[PDB]
Design a protein around this nucleic acid. Structure first.
Ligand SMILES: CC(C)C[C@@H]1CCO[C@@H]2[C@H](CN[C@@H]2C(=O)N[C@H]2[C@H]3O[C@H](OCC/C=C\[C@H]2C)[C@H](O)[C@@H](O)[C@H]3O)C1
Ligand SMILES: [Mg+2]
Ligand SMILES: [Mg+2]
Ligand SMILES: [Mg+2]
Ligand SMILES: [Mg+2]
Ligand SMILES: [Mg+2]
Ligand SMILES: [Mg+2]
Ligand SMILES: [Mg+2]
Ligand SMILES: [Mg+2]
Ligand SMILES: [Mg+2]
Ligand SMILES: [Mg+2]
Ligand SMILES: [Mg+2]
Ligand SMILES: [Mg+2]
Ligand SMILES: [Mg+2]
Ligand SMILES: [Mg+2]
Ligand SMILES: [Mg+2]
Ligand SMILES: [Mg+2]
Ligand SMILES: [Mg+2]
Ligand SMILES: [Mg+2]
Ligand SMILES: [Mg+2]
Ligand SMILES: [Mg+2]
Ligand SMILES: [Mg+2]
Ligand SMILES: [Mg+2]
Ligand SMILES: [Mg+2]
Ligand SMILES: [Mg+2]
Ligand SMILES: [Mg+2]
Ligand SMILES: [Mg+2]
Ligand SMILES: [Mg+2]
Ligand SMILES: [Mg+2]
Ligand SMILES: [Mg+2]
Ligand SMILES: [Mg+2]
Ligand SMILES: [Mg+2]
Ligand SMILES: [Mg+2]
Ligand SMILES: [Mg+2]
Ligand SMILES: [Mg+2]
Ligand SMILES: [Mg+2]
Ligand SMILES: [Mg+2]
Ligand SMILES: [Mg+2]
Ligand SMILES: [Mg+2]
Ligand SMILES: [Mg+2]
Ligand SMILES: [Mg+2]
Ligand SMILES: [Mg+2]
Ligand SMILES: [Mg+2]
Ligand SMILES: [Mg+2]
Ligand SMILES: [Mg+2]
Ligand SMILES: [Mg+2]
Ligand SMILES: [Mg+2]
Ligand SMILES: [Mg+2]
Ligand SMILES: [Mg+2]
Ligand SMILES: [Mg+2]
Ligand SMILES: [Mg+2]
Ligand SMILES: [Mg+2]
Ligand SMILES: [Mg+2]
Ligand SMILES: [Mg+2]
Ligand SMILES: [Mg+2]
Ligand SMILES: [Mg+2]
Ligand SMILES: [Mg+2]
Ligand SMILES: [Mg+2]
Ligand SMILES: [Mg+2]
Ligand SMILES: [Mg+2]
Ligand SMILES: [Mg+2]
Ligand SMILES: [Mg+2]
Ligand SMILES: [Mg+2]
Ligand SMILES: [Mg+2]
Ligand SMILES: [Mg+2]
Ligand SMILES: [Mg+2]
Ligand SMILES: [Mg+2]
Ligand SMILES: [Mg+2]
Ligand SMILES: [Mg+2]
Ligand SMILES: [Mg+2]
Ligand SMILES: [Mg+2]
Ligand SMILES: [Mg+2]
Ligand SMILES: [Mg+2]
Ligand SMILES: [Mg+2]
Ligand SMILES: [Mg+2]
Ligand SMILES: [Mg+2]
Ligand SMILES: [Mg+2]
Ligand SMILES: [Mg+2]
Ligand SMILES: [Mg+2]
Ligand SMILES: [Mg+2]
Ligand SMILES: [Mg+2]
Ligand SMILES: [Mg+2]
Ligand SMILES: [Mg+2]
Ligand SMILES: [Mg+2]
Ligand SMILES: [Mg+2]
Ligand SMILES: [Mg+2]
Ligand SMILES: [Mg+2]
Ligand SMILES: [Mg+2]
Ligand SMILES: [Mg+2]
Ligand SMILES: [Mg+2]
Ligand SMILES: [Mg+2]
Ligand SMILES: [Mg+2]
Ligand SMILES: [Mg+2]
Ligand SMILES: [Mg+2]
Ligand SMILES: [Mg+2]
Ligand SMILES: [Mg+2]
Ligand SMILES: [Mg+2]
Ligand SMILES: [Mg+2]
Ligand SMILES: [Mg+2]
Ligand SMILES: [Mg+2]
Ligand SMILES: [Mg+2]
Ligand SMILES: [Mg+2]
Ligand SMILES: [Mg+2]
Ligand SMILES: [Mg+2]
Ligand SMILES: [Mg+2]
Ligand SMILES: [Mg+2]
Ligand SMILES: [Mg+2]
Ligand SMILES: [Mg+2]
Ligand SMILES: [Mg+2]
Ligand SMILES: [Mg+2]
Ligand SMILES: [Mg+2]
Ligand SMILES: [Mg+2]
Ligand SMILES: [Mg+2]
Ligand SMILES: [Mg+2]
Ligand SMILES: [Mg+2]
Ligand SMILES: [Mg+2]
Ligand SMILES: [Mg+2]
Ligand SMILES: [Mg+2]
Ligand SMILES: [Mg+2]
Ligand SMILES: [Mg+2]
Ligand SMILES: [Mg+2]
Ligand SMILES: [Mg+2]
Ligand SMILES: [Mg+2]
Ligand SMILES: [Mg+2]
Ligand SMILES: [Mg+2]
Ligand SMILES: [Mg+2]
Ligand SMILES: [Mg+2]
Ligand SMILES: [Mg+2]
Ligand SMILES: [Mg+2]
Ligand SMILES: [Mg+2]
Ligand SMILES: [Mg+2]
Ligand SMILES: [Mg+2]
Ligand SMILES: [Mg+2]
Ligand SMILES: [Mg+2]
Ligand SMILES: [Mg+2]
Ligand SMILES: [Mg+2]
Ligand SMILES: [Mg+2]
Ligand SMILES: [Mg+2]
Ligand SMILES: [Mg+2]
Ligand SMILES: [Mg+2]
Ligand SMILES: [Mg+2]
Ligand SMILES: [Mg+2]
Ligand SMILES: [Mg+2]
Ligand SMILES: [Mg+2]
Ligand SMILES: [Mg+2]
Ligand SMILES: [Mg+2]
Ligand SMILES: [Mg+2]
Ligand SMILES: [Mg+2]
Ligand SMILES: [Mg+2]
Ligand SMILES: [Mg+2]
Ligand SMILES: [Mg+2]
Ligand SMILES: [Mg+2]
Ligand SMILES: [Mg+2]
Ligand SMILES: [Mg+2]
Ligand SMILES: [Mg+2]
Ligand SMILES: [Mg+2]
Ligand SMILES: [Mg+2]
Ligand SMILES: [Mg+2]
Ligand SMILES: [Mg+2]
Ligand SMILES: [Mg+2]
Ligand SMILES: [Mg+2]
Ligand SMILES: [Mg+2]
Ligand SMILES: [Mg+2]
Ligand SMILES: [Mg+2]
Ligand SMILES: [Mg+2]
Ligand SMILES: [Mg+2]
Ligand SMILES: [Mg+2]
Ligand SMILES: [Mg+2]
Ligand SMILES: [Mg+2]
Ligand SMILES: [Mg+2]
Ligand SMILES: [Mg+2]
Ligand SMILES: [Mg+2]
Ligand SMILES: [Mg+2]
Ligand SMILES: [Mg+2]
Ligand SMILES: [Mg+2]
Ligand SMILES: [Mg+2]
Ligand SMILES: [Mg+2]
Ligand SMILES: [Mg+2]
Ligand SMILES: [Mg+2]
Ligand SMILES: [Mg+2]
Ligand SMILES: [Mg+2]
Ligand SMILES: [Mg+2]
Ligand SMILES: [Mg+2]
Ligand SMILES: [Mg+2]
Ligand SMILES: [Mg+2]
Ligand SMILES: [Mg+2]
Ligand SMILES: [Mg+2]
Ligand SMILES: [Mg+2]
Ligand SMILES: [Mg+2]
Ligand SMILES: [Mg+2]
Ligand SMILES: [Mg+2]
Ligand SMILES: [Mg+2]
Ligand SMILES: [Mg+2]
Ligand SMILES: [Mg+2]
Ligand SMILES: [Mg+2]
Ligand SMILES: [Mg+2]
Ligand SMILES: [Mg+2]
Ligand SMILES: [Mg+2]
Ligand SMILES: [Mg+2]
Ligand SMILES: [Mg+2]
Ligand SMILES: [Mg+2]
Ligand SMILES: [Mg+2]
Ligand SMILES: [Mg+2]
Ligand SMILES: [Mg+2]
Ligand SMILES: [Mg+2]
Ligand SMILES: [Mg+2]
Ligand SMILES: [Mg+2]
Ligand SMILES: [Mg+2]
Ligand SMILES: [Mg+2]
Ligand SMILES: [Mg+2]
Ligand SMILES: [Mg+2]
Ligand SMILES: [Mg+2]
Ligand SMILES: [Mg+2]
Ligand SMILES: [Mg+2]
Ligand SMILES: [Mg+2]
Ligand SMILES: [Mg+2]
Ligand SMILES: [Mg+2]
Ligand SMILES: [Mg+2]
Ligand SMILES: [Mg+2]
Ligand SMILES: [Mg+2]
Ligand SMILES: [Mg+2]
Ligand SMILES: [Mg+2]
Ligand SMILES: [Mg+2]
Ligand SMILES: [Mg+2]
Ligand SMILES: [Mg+2]
Ligand SMILES: [Mg+2]
Ligand SMILES: [Mg+2]
Ligand SMILES: [Mg+2]
Ligand SMILES: [Mg+2]
Ligand SMILES: [Mg+2]
Ligand SMILES: [Mg+2]
Ligand SMILES: [Mg+2]
Ligand SMILES: [Mg+2]
Ligand SMILES: [Mg+2]
Ligand SMILES: [Mg+2]
Ligand SMILES: [Mg+2]
Ligand SMILES: [Mg+2]
Ligand SMILES: [Mg+2]
Ligand SMILES: [Mg+2]
Ligand SMILES: [Mg+2]
Ligand SMILES: [Mg+2]
Ligand SMILES: [Mg+2]
Ligand SMILES: [Mg+2]
Ligand SMILES: [Mg+2]
Ligand SMILES: [Mg+2]
Ligand SMILES: [Mg+2]
Ligand SMILES: [Mg+2]
Ligand SMILES: [Mg+2]
Ligand SMILES: [Mg+2]
Ligand SMILES: [Mg+2]
Ligand SMILES: [Mg+2]
Ligand SMILES: [Mg+2]
Ligand SMILES: [Mg+2]
Ligand SMILES: [Mg+2]
Ligand SMILES: [Mg+2]
Lengths: 275, 48
RNA sequence: CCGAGGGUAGGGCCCGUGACUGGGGCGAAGUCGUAACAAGGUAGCUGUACCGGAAGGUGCGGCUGGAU
RNA sequence: UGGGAGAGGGUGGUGGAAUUCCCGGAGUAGCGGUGAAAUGCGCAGAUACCGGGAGGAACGCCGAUGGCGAAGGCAGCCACCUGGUCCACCCGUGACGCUGAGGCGCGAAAGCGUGGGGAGCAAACCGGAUUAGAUACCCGGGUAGUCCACGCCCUAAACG
RNA sequence: CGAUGUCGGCUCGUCGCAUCCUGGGGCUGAAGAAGGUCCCAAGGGUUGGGCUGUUCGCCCAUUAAAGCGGCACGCGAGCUG
RNA sequence: GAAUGCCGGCAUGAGUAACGAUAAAGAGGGUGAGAAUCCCUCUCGCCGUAAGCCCAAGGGUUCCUACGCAAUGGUCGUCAGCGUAGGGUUAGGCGGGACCUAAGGUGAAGCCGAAAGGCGUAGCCGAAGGGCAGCCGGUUAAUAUUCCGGCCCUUCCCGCAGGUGCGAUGGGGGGACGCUCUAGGCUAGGGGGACCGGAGCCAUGGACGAGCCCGGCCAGAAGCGCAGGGUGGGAGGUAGGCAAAUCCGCCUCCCAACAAGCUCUGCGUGGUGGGGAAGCCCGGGUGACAACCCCCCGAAGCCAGGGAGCCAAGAAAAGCCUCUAAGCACAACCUGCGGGAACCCGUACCGCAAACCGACACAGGUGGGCGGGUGCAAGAGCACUCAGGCGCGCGGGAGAACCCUCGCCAAGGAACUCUGCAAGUUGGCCCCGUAACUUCGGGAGAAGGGGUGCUCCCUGGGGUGAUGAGCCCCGGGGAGCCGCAGUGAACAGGCUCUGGCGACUGUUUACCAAAAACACAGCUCUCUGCGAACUCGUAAGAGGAGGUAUAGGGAGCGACGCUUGCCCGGUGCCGGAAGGUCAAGGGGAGGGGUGCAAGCCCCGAACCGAAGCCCCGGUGAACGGCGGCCGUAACUAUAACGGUCCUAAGGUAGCGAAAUUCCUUGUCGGGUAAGUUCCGACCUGCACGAAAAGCGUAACGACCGGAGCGCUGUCUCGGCGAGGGACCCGGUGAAAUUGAACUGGCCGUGAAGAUGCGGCCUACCCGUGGCAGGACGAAAAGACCCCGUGGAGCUUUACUGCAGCC
RNA sequence: GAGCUAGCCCUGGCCAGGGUGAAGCUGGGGUGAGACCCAGUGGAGGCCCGAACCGGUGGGGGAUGCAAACCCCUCGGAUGA
């Protein structure tokens, strides 16, 4: 339930913030954090390779467990739910009966105090993980691995899920967050339920400084630049695009498909996204 | 106003110093030319 | 001290008037179509929505104050 | 107190018919459509037929001159939460009643906001016919919307 | 063209006369008053404002009159810009 | 003899400008060959959130002392940051290193690249971050947390004693963290004292006083006290913390829980050791057995790793503690005590500046800490002042124009002008009071007013203390006094109305543009299923992202409101297993050269044969585009209506002479005496129009218009006055420019604008202060304009390639 | 060559004083319960005023400068992009 503000500055008019009700613990687990090395968008050459980055709040990385087949059979208790600033989803502190502690991204509906477990035999309950083949068709599911033992890749951000559609041999058919239909191998693990913090999408940044806090530097339009800079640059006065609209590097940017033609995963894409 | 020379002993030694010059094919050609020319100083002296 | 009133400043209601503009009434024999009254030639009406020179048309839902 | 009928209301679940789209197969010269046609679709293999899948929306028969609700309105089936109401007994209170300016709530459809959803249908719009014209009626397309959540709107031939 | 700074204003003038006013005249379709028209005349004078960057022009209030032109469309080693 | 030639020298301009902040000087005495300028004293002025003091950087002897004055110093010079010489910098505890890690850098392993080289986990390096033991005073011409004095402390080695499973680069804990707000208690620092100590003072009318003036502390081990921080104890289980583990984590039981205890800090005290003024006397000496006490204010600092709230969610590693493994348990570690040991580098001085960056002893620039008092509501603001530091390295006169900075001005009040440009006005605080419109916050300090000093009296509340006194902080009422005036000086909004643009705060052309431009939340299209797309790179490898469609890239639009129409023929992109075209390659009909021949060698048709293109569809918040003529109504006029040509389709709503309207100052209305601007309308829109968004929009703006009030030297229209210059005298002394010059006016002439030619006119020789008409004055080989088969940036359906992609 | 400047990364530091008074919370009222209203508390914010600090709006001065961008007056931000 995104929170509003009264219009008592110009920017508070529209600013909305997450409510943080599901948060039960406000400092991270010291053994699970490491320094998140800000890049500025620069690569090992020093060159900006992603424009308009840098200047965000300092953050610590929270090691997330994206395997969970690491501890088949060992239940854990949901000790806490925590803010993670490296991701839209919330995160769940888990105390294994092992004594081991681990973070998972927090699915919707998950309650502090409950138990989750992982494995071929685990119950179909929000928060459990099983290879995809053992999850009933129609189950909504998140943190899906894409190839077995490679790590959860799909449906991780706030609010997202994949739905299990059907089986075909060693592969199940998932409807991804994007709407694509994809064969994903059945030994790939997945966690029951949808990722939580679904209200994330309705947050209204409200002011320019807010994007600054997130490390987003102002984006300059190509139409605002000169010809030395950009297809759209130049012109006396304002100017329409005057050519198929383009990126700074000259490639068309309205419609032009860019997935590689002869990519081996094509055999496993059943139907591209829609909408 | 703030001018362009803002001396800094560490900066000087790390940028133009003997060891920087030797680390690199170009800096080595610098040392070699200033030797062939007979420069009394191959590199800027800083106090360090 | 209070004090008719004069002055300064700012509000409230009303009246008159105003380039231009909105529709309304009225007006023996103007121009356009024919929406309604018969099943009025697409039953009519209807709240709403959108569109169209105009009456109107269409969508959704409602009424019979509809025919056979 | 004991009983009853009922699409009264809300939440969750879930079942079959049908349409569309997709995949497989089989098959070929048309299908569709109309007052008649054209546009449209089709040898790049359509229509018609079989199997598989996906998805939304509505619930046939029962069904009625029926039932329930204060109205608006309510129809597959199931469970749960819940309102109204009638009958019997003649047991309890002892006029505690009627109405009700204001107030508060409810209030078809359309419409509006924010998310979602989108099969069929369809304002707008496009095209084909008709016509003197045809910003219509008829035909082929078609976007809001029609669906769900929350929040607004508060109108009506909201009629007996 | 190894630079003759360009519109308007301001300031400071100075000159021409094809004279706007003031002085002197002839003709008048000059009764008077007031005009018209031409001649002589450059001594002096020739206002303040609204609009516009404006020169110009229009307008307001006046005036005896609110003249027209030259001086590198006078004047930026004088100002403005 | 010329090349705006080159190098050097030397002229001219000229005894001219200038001598570098308008904080400011005067005199006496000394020294010396020489003194405005050096030293000393007295007077005067200036800074005092500095123009004082302490760190860091940077500088590198500039520090102190003697002797000097050629040059340097904008003058002088006896002086100096100058010349010569001698001296001067002292650490286990300060800072850095023999400690740690951050970005980054480097890099065993490993990866990549024609060479050179590029990467790269560990590890190593890397600090103003972490970690770590010294405070106060005295001493020198010059260093001092360094020497010395007093009182404290750290580590290393070795020994003694007690204790214990000792033991690590491995496990674990801790270290360890944000922003805003902030509690208690202290300290720094400050104010006051009628108390305590002091040399003295009584003036000029008065005061011998509860007088004036000065001062009234600093450091300190253990112990103690106050205030804080940190921390549950026990037991059983145990599969996790990449071996082990008694540690840690997880489950359970019991006891403890706003505590306590233990522990660690800060503050107070504390054996002891220091300091100690005014004044007077010659840095010293006295004062002085100096006194060293009470009250108040009180941090942003300390206790600290404190508390609360919030979202944008806030380093690492070591030191340290605990666990155990090899081992070893004659060892080893822990605690106590004792003796011994303890290295390298810096330390001078300048440090908002004459020593640093600016060529200069340059009005500029330079990070951190301290920065006293009083009053003004507060404060680091302002004025004045303490400590401390200065008067800015040319002076002396004069009292013209003119210029600068400043003050005032009769009557008028924007008439000034492109424009109220500039300058007035206003101006703090308390109180009263405040409109349209609004997104309900705002608009708002709206507007507009009133109050404001001092004195006496009465009185309310808080803090400290004790509930009182005293001191301190917020008030309340009554009566008075003075002046032209009570934020009496200084610091301190002019206001309103109404348009255009842009929502807003932000950003920008360093050095002519700050804006309407850029950005911005927000909206839409589109690409991207992750070894993502995309970007940088030959590559490896990186970024994207230790992210995963509620996410990431690209593009346009630009809060919000109401909206965003018609065209898919062309270009783009998207879809399309047919068809057409299509390269290498396949195929090899059929020819050819040569050889006696086997053969060797070459040309080669049909046909099969990608992407691309053609072709068929889709698609606008993709590139884009959204008609012409003629007729028509019972007054005229105009055309709801019609006809016809053309289109891919003919511009919808909304707006409109506009940041767009050419004709144009369109026309009408408003405002004005008067209005090319402005505002409101009209619509024949030269040439608006819907995300190169259309129309609106509260708030906002050093944006650009228009008006009004207030007030003014803007002006009619100028006048006076101040200071700094200009001027004169002494000192020091440039510059661009310069063919040479013995360099007048007119009218002509002349390459067409003549000091220089002709004719006339005028004119004794040489300066000084002034003004700028001329010397087509200076400056700059015109930046406009053209020319050169000159250059460069940029574009594209110019050509031709290349990367990249297929 | 990034000791100037532009961006980013790491690690530190700095922002006198005053003003306005969001959410929440407490209580009161309210109702079937509610929404909600009132008061107090509270202390938010690319909030307001204004030094330091960062700027560079208008004018004036300077223009062989104090200065190859300075000086005076005025003006913008000043808890934040
Ligand atoms: C239609 C017009 C374009 C006619 C045009 C007007 C322009 O100039 C004039 C040209 C004719 N020549 C004039 C000229 O070059 N003048 C220059 C001046 O430059 C410096 O003065 C300030 C710059 C102003 C002008 C520049 C160009 C310099 O100091 C002066 O000596 C002088 O060189 C004509
Ligand atoms: Mg809000
Ligand atoms: Mg509100
Ligand atoms: Mg949450
Ligand atoms: Mg860690
Ligand atoms: Mg990284
Ligand atoms: Mg690197
Ligand atoms: Mg970079
Ligand atoms: Mg990029
Ligand atoms: Mg970037
Ligand atoms: Mg993310
Ligand atoms: Mg989160
Ligand atoms: Mg798979
Ligand atoms: Mg969003
Ligand atoms: Mg962030
Ligand atoms: Mg954005
Ligand atoms: Mg942008
Ligand atoms: Mg541009
Ligand atoms: Mg540009
Ligand atoms: Mg470039
Ligand atoms: Mg280019
Ligand atoms: Mg280009
Ligand atoms: Mg362009
Ligand atoms: Mg442009
Ligand atoms: Mg243009
Ligand atoms: Mg442009
Ligand atoms: Mg174009
Ligand atoms: Mg393009
Ligand atoms: Mg897809
Ligand atoms: Mg600079
Ligand atoms: Mg520097
Ligand atoms: Mg250094
Ligand atoms: Mg350094
Ligand atoms: Mg450096
Ligand atoms: Mg380097
Ligand atoms: Mg070096
Ligand atoms: Mg080499
Ligand atoms: Mg070599
Ligand atoms: Mg030598
Ligand atoms: Mg060198
Ligand atoms: Mg009177
Ligand atoms: Mg009809
Ligand atoms: Mg009819
Ligand atoms: Mg009909
Ligand atoms: Mg009909
Ligand atoms: Mg229609
Ligand atoms: Mg066909
Ligand atoms: Mg075929
Ligand atoms: Mg579907
Ligand atoms: Mg009874
Ligand atoms: Mg309703
Ligand atoms: Mg509805
Ligand atoms: Mg048609
Ligand atoms: Mg016909
Ligand atoms: Mg639809
Ligand atoms: Mg009915
Ligand atoms: Mg020329
Ligand atoms: Mg010349
Ligand atoms: Mg010229
Ligand atoms: Mg010249
Ligand atoms: Mg004038
Ligand atoms: Mg005359
Ligand atoms: Mg005259
Ligand atoms: Mg004029
Ligand atoms: Mg002219
Ligand atoms: Mg004109
Ligand atoms: Mg007359
Ligand atoms: Mg003239
Ligand atoms: Mg002319
Ligand atoms: Mg002319
Ligand atoms: Mg001229
Ligand atoms: Mg003239
Ligand atoms: Mg001129
Ligand atoms: Mg000039
Ligand atoms: Mg001029
Ligand atoms: Mg000149
Ligand atoms: Mg001149
Ligand atoms: Mg001249
Ligand atoms: Mg010659
Ligand atoms: Mg020369
Ligand atoms: Mg030459
Ligand atoms: Mg030369
Ligand atoms: Mg010589
Ligand atoms: Mg020379
Ligand atoms: Mg010489
Ligand atoms: Mg000379
Ligand atoms: Mg001379
Ligand atoms: Mg002289
Ligand atoms: Mg001279
Ligand atoms: Mg000079
Ligand atoms: Mg000078
Ligand atoms: Mg000064
Ligand atoms: Mg001055
Ligand atoms: Mg003197
Ligand atoms: Mg002297
Ligand atoms: Mg002398
Ligand atoms: Mg002096
Ligand atoms: Mg002296
Ligand atoms: Mg004296
Ligand atoms: Mg002071
Ligand atoms: Mg030096
Ligand atoms: Mg000398
Ligand atoms: Mg000298
Ligand atoms: Mg000098
Ligand atoms: Mg001497
Ligand atoms: Mg020394
Ligand atoms: Mg020592
Ligand atoms: Mg050693
Ligand atoms: Mg290290
Ligand atoms: Mg290093
Ligand atoms: Mg190191
Ligand atoms: Mg360090
Ligand atoms: Mg130390
Ligand atoms: Mg100590
Ligand atoms: Mg022990
Ligand atoms: Mg921590
Ligand atoms: Mg941490
Ligand atoms: Mg830290
Ligand atoms: Mg924060
Ligand atoms: Mg406190
Ligand atoms: Mg103390
Ligand atoms: Mg005080
Ligand atoms: Mg164990
Ligand atoms: Mg003594
Ligand atoms: Mg502080
Ligand atoms: Mg602390
Ligand atoms: Mg690290
Ligand atoms: Mg052993
Ligand atoms: Mg042994
Ligand atoms: Mg050593
Ligand atoms: Mg020292
Ligand atoms: Mg400075
Ligand atoms: Mg400083
Ligand atoms: Mg100095
Ligand atoms: Mg000086
Ligand atoms: Mg200086
Ligand atoms: Mg003091
Ligand atoms: Mg004050
Ligand atoms: Mg002086
Ligand atoms: Mg000074
Ligand atoms: Mg001086
Ligand atoms: Mg004089
Ligand atoms: Mg005065
Ligand atoms: Mg006076
Ligand atoms: Mg006056
Ligand atoms: Mg006035
Ligand atoms: Mg007046
Ligand atoms: Mg005016
Ligand atoms: Mg102007
Ligand atoms: Mg004031
Ligand atoms: Mg008003
Ligand atoms: Mg109001
Ligand atoms: Mg108003
Ligand atoms: Mg308004
Ligand atoms: Mg309001
Ligand atoms: Mg006021
Ligand atoms: Mg007020
Ligand atoms: Mg009073
Ligand atoms: Mg007084
Ligand atoms: Mg103010
Ligand atoms: Mg703006
Ligand atoms: Mg702008
Ligand atoms: Mg706008
Ligand atoms: Mg806006
Ligand atoms: Mg700001
Ligand atoms: Mg600029
Ligand atoms: Mg420029
Ligand atoms: Mg420049
Ligand atoms: Mg400027
Ligand atoms: Mg500009
Ligand atoms: Mg600005
Ligand atoms: Mg810009
Ligand atoms: Mg904006
Ligand atoms: Mg938007
Ligand atoms: Mg969207
Ligand atoms: Mg590349
Ligand atoms: Mg290569
Ligand atoms: Mg990464
Ligand atoms: Mg993006
Ligand atoms: Mg905006
Ligand atoms: Mg923009
Ligand atoms: Mg509105
Ligand atoms: Mg098209
Ligand atoms: Mg098409
Ligand atoms: Mg197309
Ligand atoms: Mg092909
Ligand atoms: Mg075009
Ligand atoms: Mg076109
Ligand atoms: Mg007729
Ligand atoms: Mg429309
Ligand atoms: Mg118009
Ligand atoms: Mg307009
Ligand atoms: Mg236009
Ligand atoms: Mg016009
Ligand atoms: Mg015009
Ligand atoms: Mg006009
Ligand atoms: Mg008028
Ligand atoms: Mg017109
Ligand atoms: Mg466009
Ligand atoms: Mg445009
Ligand atoms: Mg507008
Ligand atoms: Mg506006
Ligand atoms: Mg507005
Ligand atoms: Mg602004
Ligand atoms: Mg502005
Ligand atoms: Mg104006
Ligand atoms: Mg004057
Ligand atoms: Mg004077
Ligand atoms: Mg004389
Ligand atoms: Mg002399
Ligand atoms: Mg000299
Ligand atoms: Mg000669
Ligand atoms: Mg001569
Ligand atoms: Mg002469
Ligand atoms: Mg002469
Ligand atoms: Mg001629
Ligand atoms: Mg001549
Ligand atoms: Mg002559
Ligand atoms: Mg001659
Ligand atoms: Mg001659
Ligand atoms: Mg001759
Ligand atoms: Mg002659
Ligand atoms: Mg002659
Ligand atoms: Mg003459
Ligand atoms: Mg003279
Ligand atoms: Mg002179
Ligand atoms: Mg002259
Ligand atoms: Mg001249
Ligand atoms: Mg010449
Ligand atoms: Mg000249
Ligand atoms: Mg020049
Ligand atoms: Mg040249
Ligand atoms: Mg030339
Ligand atoms: Mg030139
Ligand atoms: Mg140029
Ligand atoms: Mg030319
Ligand atoms: Mg050519
Ligand atoms: Mg040629
Ligand atoms: Mg060329
Ligand atoms: Mg080129
Ligand atoms: Mg190549
Ligand atoms: Mg590409
Ligand atoms: Mg601040
Ligand atoms: Mg206030
Ligand atoms: Mg309050
Ligand atoms: Mg609270
Ligand atoms: Mg602010
Ligand atoms: Mg204020
Ligand atoms: Mg600046
Ligand atoms: Mg000014
Ligand atoms: Mg200059
Ligand atoms: Mg300045
Ligand atoms: Mg100032
Ligand atoms: Mg401010
Ligand atoms: Mg502030």
């Amino acid at each position: 339930a995104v929170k509003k503000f009264k219009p008592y500055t110009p920017s508070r008019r529209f600013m909305t913030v997450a409510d943080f009700s599901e948060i039960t613990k406000t400092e991270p687990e010291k053994s699970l954090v490491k320094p998140l090395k800000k890049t500025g968008g620069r690569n090992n050459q020093g060159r900006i390779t992603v424009r308009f980055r840098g200047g965000g709040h300092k953050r610590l990385y929270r090691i997330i467990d994206f395997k969970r087949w690491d501890k088949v059979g060992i239940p854990a208790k949901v000790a806490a739910i925590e803010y993670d600033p490296n991701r839209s989803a919330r995160i769940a502190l888990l105390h294994y009966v092992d004594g081991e502690k681990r973070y998972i991204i927090a699915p919707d509906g998950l309650q502090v105090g409950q138990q989750v477990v992982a494995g071929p035999d685990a119950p179909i309950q929000v928060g459990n993980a099983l290879p995809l083949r053992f999850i009933p068709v129609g189950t909504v599911v998140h943190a899906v691995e894409l190839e077995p033992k490679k790590g959860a890749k799909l449906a991780r951000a706030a609010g997202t899920s994949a739905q299990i559609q059907g089986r075909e041999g060693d592969y199940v058919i998932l409807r991804l967050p994007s709407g694509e239909l994809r064969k994903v191998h059945g030994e790939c693990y997945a966690t029951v339920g949808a990722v939580g913090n679904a209200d994330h999408k309705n947050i209204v940044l409200g002011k320019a400084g807010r994007s600054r806090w997130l490390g987003r530097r102002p984006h300059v339009r190509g139409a605002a630049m000169n010809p030395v800079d950009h297809p759209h640059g130049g012109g006396e006065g304002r100017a329409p695009r005057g050519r198929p609209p383009a990126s700074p590097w000259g490639w068309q940017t309205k419609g032009l498909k860019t997935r590689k033609r002869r990519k081996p995963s094509s055999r496993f894409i059943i139907a591209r996204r829609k909408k | 106003m703030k001018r362009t020379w803002q001396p800094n002993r560490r900066k000087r030694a790390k940028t133009h110093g003997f060891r920087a010059r030797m680390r690199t094919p170009g800096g080595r050609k610098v040392l070699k030319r200033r030797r062939q020319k007979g420069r009394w100083r191959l590199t800027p002296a800083v106090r360090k």
